[PDB]
Design a binder for this molecule. Structure first.
Ligand SMILES: *[C@@H]1O[C@H](CO)[C@@H](O[C@@H]2O[C@H](CO)[C@@H](O[C@@H]3O[C@H](CO[C@H]4O[C@H](CO[C@H]5O[C@H](CO)[C@@H](O)[C@H](O)[C@@H]5O)[C@@H](O)[C@H](O)[C@@H]4O)[C@@H](O)[C@H](O[C@@H]4O[C@H](CO)[C@@H](O)[C@H](O)[C@@H]4O[C@H]4O[C@H](CO)[C@@H](O)[C@H](O)[C@@H]4O)[C@@H]3O)[C@H](O)[C@H]2NC(C)=O)[C@H](O)[C@H]1NC(C)=O
Ligand SMILES: *[C@@H]1O[C@H](CO)[C@@H](O[C@@H]2O[C@H](CO)[C@@H](O[C@@H]3O[C@H](CO[C@H]4O[C@H](CO)[C@@H](O)[C@H](O)[C@@H]4O)[C@@H](O)[C@H](O)[C@@H]3O)[C@H](O)[C@H]2NC(C)=O)[C@H](O)[C@H]1NC(C)=O
Ligand SMILES: *[C@@H]1O[C@H](CO)[C@@H](O[C@@H]2O[C@H](CO)[C@@H](O)[C@H](O)[C@H]2NC(C)=O)[C@H](O)[C@H]1NC(C)=O
Ligand code: CA
Ligand code: CA
Ligand code: CA
Ligand code: CU
Ligand code: CU
Lengths: 693, 644
């Protein structure tokens, strides 16, 4: 055929309901509870209107269709060519239309009301009205298909364009997909894994009536954060298999720069063909992806950021046993007889006698300037109610003499960061770690998945996942980080995705104080390198961060010292607050580092950001400004979604004095900048093979 | 000693200007009390190019660069060669040119950035690098890159008051060797963003027009906050963006170098239009969330014409400007405007002189002794036309006339256009020049069929004889295709419509005569060529089983002229149907609309149709005949959805 859909707009009311659980399928159900009427400790509700179902005309009114949805306007899947047809009946008060975004039209579709020389009956369905039900038309074009390089199905949607703003916010949108020819072939017989998330910011407090003067109608107040239209862990549906994977259909939406990020307390995501686990999502995007679902149980698919949590956005996703249908110093380096080149494949486990102790740190040592300099000084130079310059925090060290070895020492060309740590695929990590600070903290890696404290997969008597608890009081614990491939680089991605680790004594706070480090991840087996003694090769790391001492467990121990008056100082006001918020940029501020990059020094920068939230522009501006390659080569650019990351090849054929781009409002002349060098001389190698060691 | 091996120089500077929008204001005092009137103006600064003589000559441009927004000039450049960017200041704050590729900068105990910083105004300077590959298009197509330029003095303060540059590139044998860049397809750069002002130029700027409007709390915070916020691409809040002359069916490529503050993450959309992109493959999309500072180019294509739009789907920043229509056309029509055939009435015209009865009421083959064309004299003459409305023009034709012995023509003219007279454009075109110098004829019956394409638009077209033979003069019938690319023949004449699809009532047949509708098409001739009913009644009807539905922009009529007694059709009506069983008369302004046409037969005449009918079947009935009721004809339309 060429299938025809019939859409409505029944003005119904929303729940954001509770219960969740399941419902008991096929022959005999019972949605949970049913304790009668009175105050179910009440569940606020607003009234909206969303596109709908129906086989012809009918009345209807109630709750949601296929559990995992209801809200989400009716999904429209389609093959290529076989044209689709609609017919919306505005059974609502809003005159709303229907757009399309991503296909063929004829002006007989782009629901708009602008100067488009065409006149009515061209602008007819380009905007309907109450009670009036008007028909729609558009085709699936060859110029609209996949790209033989694109997954078989493009995440697309639609909605009523008669003013997005006072529309969307009520429920104007559904799912629209297009995919390779005869496709009703294998979807109509196998993949019940046709699920489509819908991260939205319904501002239901902009779409229906006004007032403001702090008893029959329906509305209350402000913002939201949801998914498919649910919140606080709620939202039924969502179930995947074991050995098999799933396919995600996302759709941004928020009618305002308000962004929203999202991980999966359980996985790594696959877009394009790059591991990214984070669904870096914008105010309105159509990002598809998937997930090789190993393991089992339920994971908190949720929005990871700032104040988007308690406001919802969190939604569980379960998995289960699926059916089965089969038919002064320096002088050492030994030597004997060279075996030509020497193969010897497979992996090996890395060692790390590392720990985390206290110490005061400063973002100096550069110029000063009192009174006047009310910027580059509210920090580095302390006052009667200012301390800046140096604070007492705690980082990660490789330690040179504990009771269990060492192998450290370090240059400042990599700030407070944690002694970097490679990770070949398959390879495994042993991180003999021990406290050595005041308050017990932890150390977990954010990029891996198999993290069981070797010798046994058990856990501190009572507990669940080392993160949330296993604090260590001044104790010492042995860790094992094993590395599958799931944990690392595809093909389409440059091998070596940046990463990081830190405490989870809570799941965040400690950090700010100072605990942090990088943790690469890569793969290869052709022809490697190295060095010897105190000489590395992949020490190109950088990470900007928002360190708010106003939250470090050492604000008092810091103050009572560096601060004149004992504790007479003020409580907390926008005043000194922001005057104690130094910005790292690798923990250094304004200037330091300047790095040691040479001429033609083919570089390989591993970079990321942390601290506070907000996307970030960042670049190289020097004796060449500089470009790099995130596949394609790119300008003054680098947009990492905070608490997120990506590295980058930076073949360095430039020069010196590199304003290291933070390129963002206050951040610029508040603290960041930085520089880069341009050396010369010193090098070796060997003719045709390997030898220098 | 004289050959060549690649290099490109570009003259450019940073001048200040005035900035606004709008095209609908209020009279001197049409409301004696107080209402509107104002016109928010601004003192921004952008990049301009020329030759060297600063102002006067020849800081100039225009034409396919209409859409250039504030944006500097398209500083293109293939690969491997060298960018020669000579720059001159031209305003306050010593701004500075810059691009991530200002690479290959000597070095030697100096500072390629700590020194080349800013350039005090007045004083000028140049920058000149090599086109290294570590900065350019790849094996994975999208033939031209999209780099960017702007001052690195304060870095932002600058950027805001305008001053922005789109430096693209391409690879080797790719750009029209000499005078031109690419063209294999069309290139457009749309710079999305959010202008805030204040955090911009300074003093005077933020000081033009002062006081306090309706419902104010204070200033410097609760004042007209989002008022000084421009939400626009190339700075054209509201569907104000200019230069978007499309080209139905010509691969296209957009350079969407966004940038801005930290809110400017505008997820762009192209009103009903998909496309492709690359980053190591043919990844396809229909939206693109340009992040402030990004750049990415994209390759789409218009399958159909009409007017569409583009806008940050971010409800707010959209419902606040940022959006434009890109008028695309159908190169397949270039239909004649009819300056030979009646239609365009003598009414529409004018020049500056009749110079002897020779005048605007004459043009294109009109033959009559020696009063068959327009003419002029020595003065810097000029002729204008008013299509009665705006339309697209694929091009014009031109001729001449001889007076007794000596002959008259023209040899080169310049064209000017606009949409209200008030405005006036001295049309450039492809080839270089501060204007496009065309070419005339050189005798009567020249016919220099020129052809804008870059096609033009407007309602008014002027022609200015730059050179002529003894006496300027001419005829013509310039042709176009109009707004939403329509108005072109449909079968009938082209015989592209089965004479089995044209049924009708009375069809008098004879022993010589045989006026079966099968022979009822414009200009047609032959044996019993035209249509004649059994007998001339005041009703009758001719049918056209159009088959597939259609959009009709109008109809043309005629009438044979047989054996010493020709005959036309003056008054008449038209029907419409969705099969041969239901009809809907075409009423107008009120009841029926008596269509007036034909005053002879040796010519064709046509009726408009304020409200374009559109059906798969069309009937027609005449009223005020002449001698008899003959009719030959054809319609007017442009395809549109069917099988429904
Ligand atoms: C004013 O400026 C404008 C632009 O700013 C200039 O106009 C442009 O001129 C160029 C010519 O130099 C035009 O480009 C032409 O493109 C056609 C393509 O026609 C085919 O495809 C059309 C749709 O494009 C798709 O298919 C293409 C397949 O060829 C493919 O590349 C593309 O990516 C698309 O997917 C379709 O509408 C047509 O029906 C047709 O199928 C091309 O044919 C032109 O010439 C080629 O030349 C080589 C070598 O001479 C031939 O070997 C090829 O076969 C082509 O044919 C021509 O040459 C043969 C003899 O070789 C000749 O017999 C024939 O008549 C052709 O001339 C050419 O590349 C571009 O389209 C114009 N832009 C516009 C407005 O559309 C003006 O030059 C400039 N000056 C003026 C007038 O003011
Ligand atoms: C989703 O989960 C969220 C998790 O917090 C829910 O937030 C809770 O929302 C309720 C009301 O919706 C709050 O109830 C009130 O709590 C206050 C105590 O805190 C307030 O008062 C202090 C006083 O100084 C003030 O500083 C705080 O800012 C608060 O305003 C009581 O005094 C009131 O009587 C009332 O009970 C909860 O406090 C709040 N939880 C938190 C964060 O503590 C959210 O409502 C849930 N919504 C969904 C999606 O279901
Ligand atoms: C030095 O800078 C001044 C401005 O700071 C330049 O003055 C302009 O000169 C041009 C002609 O060269 C005039 O058209 C402008 O009106 C002048 N601007 C004004 C009003 O200041 C000057 O040209 C520069 N060169 C010198 C030294 O004369
Ligand atoms: Ca319509
Ligand atoms: Ca419309
Ligand atoms: Ca923590
Ligand atoms: Cu969020
Ligand atoms: Cu926006």
């Amino acid at each position: 055929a060429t299938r025809r859909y019939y859409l409505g707009a029944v003005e119904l009311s929303w729940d954001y309901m509770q219960s969740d659980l399941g419902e008991l399928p096929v022959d005999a159900r019972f949605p949970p509870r049913v304790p009668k009427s009175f105050p179910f400790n009440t569940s606020v509700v607003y009234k909206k209107t969303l596109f709908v179902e129906f086989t012809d005309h009918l009345f209807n009114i109630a709750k949601p269709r296929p559990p995992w949805m209801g809200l989400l306007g009716p999904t429209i899947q389609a093959e290529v060519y076989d044209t689709v047809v609609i017919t919306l009946k505005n059974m609502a008060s809003h005159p709303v239309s229907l757009h399309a975004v991503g296909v063929s039209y004829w002006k007989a579709s782009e629901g708009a009301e602008y100067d488009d020389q065409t006149s009515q009956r061209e602008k007819e369905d380009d905007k309907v009205f109450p009670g009036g039900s008007h028909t729609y038309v558009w085709q699936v074009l060859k110029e609209n298909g996949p790209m033989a390089s694109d997954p078989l199905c493009l995440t697309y949607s639609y909605l009523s364009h008669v003013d997005l703003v006072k529309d969307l916010n009520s429920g104007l949108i559904g799912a629209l997909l297009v995919c390779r020819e005869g496709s009703l072939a294998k979807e109509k017989t196998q993949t019940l894994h046709k699920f489509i998330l819908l991260f939205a910011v319904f501002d239901e407090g902009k779409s229906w009536h006004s007032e403001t003067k702090n008893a029959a109608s329906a509305r209350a107040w402000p913002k939201m954060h949801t998914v498919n239209g649910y919140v606080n862990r709620s939202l039924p549906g969502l179930i995947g298999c074991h050995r098999k994977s799933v396919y995600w259909h996302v759709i941004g939406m928020g009618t305002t720069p308000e962004v929203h990020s999202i991980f999966l307390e359980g996985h790594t995501f696959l877009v394009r063909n790059h591991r990214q686990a984070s669904l870096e999502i914008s105010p309105i995007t159509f990002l598809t992806a998937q997930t090789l679902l190993m393991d089992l149980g339920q994971f908190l698919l949720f929005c990871h950021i700032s104040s988007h949590q308690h406001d919802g956005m969190e939604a569980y996703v379960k998995v289960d046993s699926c059916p089965e249908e089969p038919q002064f110093d320096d002088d050492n380096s030994p030597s004997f007889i060279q075996i030509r080149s020497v193969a010897k494949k497979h992996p090996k486990t890395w060692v790390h006698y590392i720990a985390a102790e206290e110490e005061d740190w400063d973002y100096a040592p550069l110029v000063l300037a009192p009174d006047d300099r009310s910027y580059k000084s509210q920090y580095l130079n302390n006052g009667p109610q200012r301390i800046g310059r140096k604070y007492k925090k705690v980082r990660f060290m490789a330690y040179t003499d504990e009771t269990f070895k060492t192998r450290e020492a370090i240059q400042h060309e990599s700030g407070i960061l944690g002694p970097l740590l490679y990770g070949e695929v398959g390879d495994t990590l042993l991180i003999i770690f021990k406290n050595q600070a005041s308050r017990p903290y932890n150390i977990y890696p954010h990029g891996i998945t198999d993290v069981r404290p070797l010798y046994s997969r058990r856990l501190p008597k009572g507990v669940k996942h080392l993160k949330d608890f296993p604090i260590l009081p001044g104790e010492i614990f042995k860790y094992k980080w094993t590395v599958t491939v799931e944990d690392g680089p595809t093909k389409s991605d440059p091998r070596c995705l940046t990463r990081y680790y830190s405490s989870f004594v809570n799941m965040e706070r400690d950090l700010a104080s100072g605990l942090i480090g990088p943790l690469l991840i890569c793969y290869k087996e052709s022809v490697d390198q190295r060095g010897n003694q105190i000489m590395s090769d992949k020490r190109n790391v950088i990470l900007f961060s928002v360190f708010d001492e106003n939250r470090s467990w050492y604000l008092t121990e810091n103050i009572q010292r560096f601060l004149p008056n004992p504790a007479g100082v003020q409580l907390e006001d926008p005043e000194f607050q922001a005057s104690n918020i130094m910005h790292s940029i690798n923990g250094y501020v304004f200037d330091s580092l300047q790095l040691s990059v040479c001429l033609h020094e083919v570089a390989y920068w591993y970079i990321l950001s942390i601290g506070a939230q907000t996307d970030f522009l960042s670049v190289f501006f020097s004796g060449y400004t500089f470009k790099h390659k995130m596949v394609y080569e790119d300008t003054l650019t680098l947009f990492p979604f905070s608490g997120e990351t990506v590295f980058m090849s930076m073949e360095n054929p430039g020069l010196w004095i590199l304003g290291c781009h933070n390129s963002d409002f206050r951040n610029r002349g508040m603290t960041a900048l930085l520089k880069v060098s341009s050396c010369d001389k010193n090098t070796g190698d060997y003719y045709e093979d390997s030898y220098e060691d | 000693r004289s050959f060549q091996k690649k290099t490109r120089h570009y003259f450019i500077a940073a001048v200040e200007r005035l900035w606004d929008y709008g095209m609908s204001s209020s009279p001197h005092v049409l409301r004696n009390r107080a209402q509107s009137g104002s016109v928010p103006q601004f003192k921004k600064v952008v990049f301009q190019e020329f030759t060297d003589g600063s102002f006067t000559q020849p800081l100039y441009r225009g034409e396919l660069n209409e859409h250039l927004g504030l944006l500097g000039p398209y500083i293109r450049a293939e690969v491997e060669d060298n960018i020669m960017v000579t720059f001159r200041n031209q305003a306050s704050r010593p701004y500075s040119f810059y691009s991530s590729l200002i690479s290959y900068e000597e070095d030697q105990r100096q500072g390629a950035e700590p020194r080349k910083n800013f350039v005090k105004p007045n004083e000028t300077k140049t920058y000149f690098w090599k086109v290294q590959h570590h900065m350019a298009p790849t094996k994975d197509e999208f033939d031209c890159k999209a780099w960017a330029y702007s001052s690195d003095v304060d870095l932002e303060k600058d950027v805001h008051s305008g001053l922005i540059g789109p430096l693209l590139v391409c690879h080797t044998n790719t750009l029209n060797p000499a005078h031109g860049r690419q063209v294999t397809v069309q290139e457009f750069a749309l710079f999305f963003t959010i202008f805030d002002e204040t955090k911009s130029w300074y003093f005077t700027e933020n000081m033009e027009r002062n006081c306090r409007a309706p419902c104010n709390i204070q200033m410097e915070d609760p004042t007209f906050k989002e008022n000084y916020r421009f939400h626009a691409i190339n700075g054209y809040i509201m569907d104000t963006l200019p230069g978007l002359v499309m080209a139905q069916d010509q691969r296209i490529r957009w350079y969407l170098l966004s940038m801005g503050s930290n809110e400017n993450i505008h997820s762009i959309h192209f009103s009903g239009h998909v496309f492709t992109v690359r980053k190591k493959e043919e990844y396809k999309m229909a939206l693109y969330n340009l992040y402030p500072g990004v750049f990415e180019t994209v390759e789409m294509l218009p399958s159909k014409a009409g007017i569409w739009r583009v806008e940050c789907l971010i409800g707010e920043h959209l419902h606040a400007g940022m959006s434009t229509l890109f008028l695309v056309y159908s190169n397949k029509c270039q239909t004649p405007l009819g300056m030979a055939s009646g239609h365009i009435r003598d009414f529409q015209i004018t020049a500056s002189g009749q110079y002897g009865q020779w005048a605007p009421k004459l043009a294109r083959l009109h033959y009559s002794g020696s009063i068959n064309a327009w003419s002029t004299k020595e003065p810097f003459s000029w002729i204008k036309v008013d299509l009665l409305a705006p339309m697209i023009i694929h091009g014009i034709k031109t001729q001449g006339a001889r007076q007794k012995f000596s002959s008259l023509y023209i040899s080169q003219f310049i064209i000017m256009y606009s949409l209200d007279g008030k405005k006036w454009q001295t049309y450039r075109g492809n080839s270089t020049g501060t204007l496009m110098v065309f070419f005339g004829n050189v005798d009567s019956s020249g016919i220099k069929h020129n052809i804008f394409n870059p096609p033009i638009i407007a309602r008014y077209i002027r022609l200015h004889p730059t050179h002529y033979s003894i006496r300027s003069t001419l005829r013509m019938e310039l042709m176009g295709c109009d707004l939403n690319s329509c108005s072109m023949p449909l079968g009938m004449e082209s015989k592209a419509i089965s004479d089995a699809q044209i049924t009708a009532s009375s069809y008098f047949t004879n022993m010589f005569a045989t006026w079966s509708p099968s022979k009822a098409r414009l200009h047609l001739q032959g044996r019993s060529n035209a249509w004649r009913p059994q007998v001339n009644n005041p009703k009758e009807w001719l049918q056209v089983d159009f088959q597939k539905t259609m959009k009709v922009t109008g109809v043309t009529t005629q009438g044979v002229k047989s054996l010493l007694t020709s005959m036309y059709v003056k008054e008449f009506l038209i029907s419409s149907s969705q099969d041969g069983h239901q009809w809907t008369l075409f009423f107008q302004n009120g009841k029926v609309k008596v269509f007036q046409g034909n005053q002879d037969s040796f010519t064709p005449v046509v009726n408009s149709l304020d409200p374009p009918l559109l059906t798969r079947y069309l009937r027609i009935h005449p009223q005020s005949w002449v001698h008899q009721i003959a009719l030959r004809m054809e319609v007017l339309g442009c395809e549109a959805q069917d099988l429904y």
